[PDB]
Write an enzyme that holds these catalytic residues in place. Structure first.
Site, PDB file in Angstrom:
ATOM      1  N   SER A   2       1.160  -1.415   0.185  1.00 51.09           N
ATOM      2  CA  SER A   2      -0.205  -0.206  -0.143  1.00 51.09           C
ATOM      3  C   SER A   2       1.049   1.541  -0.251  1.00 51.09           C
ATOM      4  O   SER A   2       0.610   2.475   0.653  1.00 51.09           O
ATOM      5  CB  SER A   2      -1.129  -0.137   1.144  1.00 51.09           C
ATOM      6  OG  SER A   2      -2.194  -1.112   0.825  1.00 51.09           O
ATOM      7  N   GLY A   3       1.997   1.511  -0.754  1.00 53.97           N
ATOM      8  CA  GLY A   3       2.654   2.372  -0.770  1.00 53.97           C
ATOM      9  C   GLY A   3       3.825   2.544   0.011  1.00 53.97           C
ATOM     10  O   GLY A   3       5.013   3.185   0.626  1.00 53.97           O
ATOM     11  N   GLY A  36       7.691   1.831  -1.080  1.00 56.58           N
ATOM     12  CA  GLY A  36       8.103   2.074  -2.486  1.00 56.58           C
ATOM     13  C   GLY A  36       6.996   2.248  -3.475  1.00 56.58           C
ATOM     14  O   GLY A  36       6.517   1.459  -3.199  1.00 56.58           O
ATOM     15  N   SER A  37       7.717   1.960  -4.444  1.00 61.48           N
ATOM     16  CA  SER A  37       6.889   1.317  -5.718  1.00 61.48           C
ATOM     17  C   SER A  37       7.332   0.196  -5.702  1.00 61.48           C
ATOM     18  O   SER A  37       8.174  -0.035  -6.588  1.00 61.48           O
ATOM     19  CB  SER A  37       7.262   2.508  -7.088  1.00 61.48           C
ATOM     20  OG  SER A  37       6.762   2.626  -8.038  1.00 61.48           O
ATOM     21  N   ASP A  70      16.519  -2.217   3.638  1.00 59.90           N
ATOM     22  CA  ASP A  70      16.465  -0.776   4.022  1.00 59.90           C
ATOM     23  C   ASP A  70      17.835   0.029   4.589  1.00 59.90           C
ATOM     24  O   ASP A  70      18.184   1.288   5.268  1.00 59.90           O
ATOM     25  CB  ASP A  70      15.588   0.081   4.994  1.00 59.90           C
ATOM     26  CG  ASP A  70      14.536   0.592   3.733  1.00 59.90           C
ATOM     27  OD1 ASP A  70      14.978   0.407   2.292  1.00 59.90           O
ATOM     28  OD2 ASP A  70      13.105   0.186   4.519  1.00 59.90           O
TER      29      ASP A  70
END
Ligand SMILES: C[C@H](CS(C)(=O)=O)Nc1n[nH]c2nc(Oc3ccc(F)cc3F)ncc12
Length: 346
Positions: free
Chosen positions: A29-30, A33-34, A165
């Site tokens: 859901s975002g 990221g994309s 990340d």
């Protein structure tokens, strides 16, 4: 040879990917990221495909794009998100404007799993062991995560874990937010030039939360959070105070009433005494004195998982580019070279 690419609209942009990748579907859901889930027909793997948003729009963004690709290309470890593939539909440097990154699809993040609940001690052992095994690898390449928290720990059904990340605003760190709850005090308030042990503080916060089902330091702001921290671990002594290079921060710390370190056995009632011992060694205020990942792996708490011959370190990682100043097109050319030179894992 160059694979055939096909076009599709997914996250308000046109995704152009090799035919091997089928059934693309946006995930998270975002939040991540994309990113799309996909089936890789060549390997049989369920994969996550990340398309970089406007990767060369500024000097800062072009360098960040290069940084992420360099980082992902280096990481070759079971407990760390790595690169199965990287591609561009571009046939030349002049055409080059989009970067797509491919890794394993993991079912959930740790945050969505822990769900306000206590985990069994064995589950805590296994999950924390994997985090530390991954961090040992990351730290051995002189890389720091800097923002470790449950939401960037990806986990599958079997509780197998991979770190997201690594090595990568004021408003989103403001207030009663999970974005600040796992941060070491020295970095939260810019006390000093910080080192790898900031990540160990984060593991301690995560570990405690897995054991209790509750956020360890859920501060309503920076100051409230510091007070929660200092009540548990005690106010700094003279030795640490000297190490706070920020005169401003040092002066504020001195204005607080001195508090002794609490008894962790009374804080973590019922917990395995070995878990308590480890928490005490991770959650030390002076970062010079925190346990390292390599040291923590050998702690008695991980007796049933620890294997010194199966806890690999990383190849050397050249990050001299970090202190280099270049133009957008120069960062872009360096990125292109790294895309083109990619060799898939066996
Ligand atoms: C944690 C998340 C849960 S889910 C499937 O509900 O979105 N799953 C993920 N599995 N793999 C993932 N990879 C990313 O980011 C990437 C990181 C590196 C890449 F090369 C490709 C990526 F898509 N984000 C998210 C995931």
């Amino acid at each position: 040879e160059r694979p055939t690419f096909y076009r599709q609209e997914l996250n308000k942009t046109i995704w152009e990917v090799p035919e091997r990748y089928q059934n693309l579907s946006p995930v998270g859901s975002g939040a991540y990221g994309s990113v799309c889930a996909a089936f890789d027909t060549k390997t049989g793997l369920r994969v996550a495909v990340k398309k970089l948003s406007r990767p060369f729009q500024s000097i800062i963004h072009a360098k960040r794009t290069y940084r992420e690709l360099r980082l992902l290309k280096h990481m070759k470890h079971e407990n760390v998100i790595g690169l199965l593939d990287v591609f561009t539909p571009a046939r030349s440097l002049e055409e080059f404007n989009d970067v797509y990154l491919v890794t394993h699809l993991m079912g959930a993040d740790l945050n969505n799993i822990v769900k306000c609940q206590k985990l069994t001690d064995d589950h805590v052992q296994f999950l924390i062991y994997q985090i530390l095994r991954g961090l040992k690898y990351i730290h051995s390449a002189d890389i720091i995560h800097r923002d470790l928290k449950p939401s960037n720990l990806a986990v599958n059904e079997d509780c197998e874990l991979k770190i997201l990340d690594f090595g990568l605003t004021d408003d989103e760190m403001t207030g009663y937010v999970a974005t600040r709850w796992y941060r070491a005090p020295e970095i939260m308030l810019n006390w000093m030039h910080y080192n790898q042990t900031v990540d160990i503080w984060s593991v301690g916060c995560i570990m405690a939360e897995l054991l209790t089902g509750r956020t360890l330091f859920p501060g309503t702001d920076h100051i409230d959070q510091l007070k929660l921290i200092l009540r548990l671990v005690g106010t700094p002594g003279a030795e640490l105070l000297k190490k706070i290079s920020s005169e401003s921060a040092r002066n504020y710390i001195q204005s607080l009433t001195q508090m002794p370190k609490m008894n962790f056995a009374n804080v973590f009632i019922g917990a395995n005494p070995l878990a308590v011992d480890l928490l005490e060694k991770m959650l030390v205020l002076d970062s010079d004195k925190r346990i390292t990942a390599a040291q923590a792996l050998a702690h008695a708490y991980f007796a049933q998982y620890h294997d010194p011959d199966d806890e690999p370190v990383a190849d050397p990682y050249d990050q001299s580019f970090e202190s280099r100043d270049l133009l957008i097109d120069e960062w872009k050319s360096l990125t292109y070279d790294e895309v083109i030179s990619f060799v898939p894992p066996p």
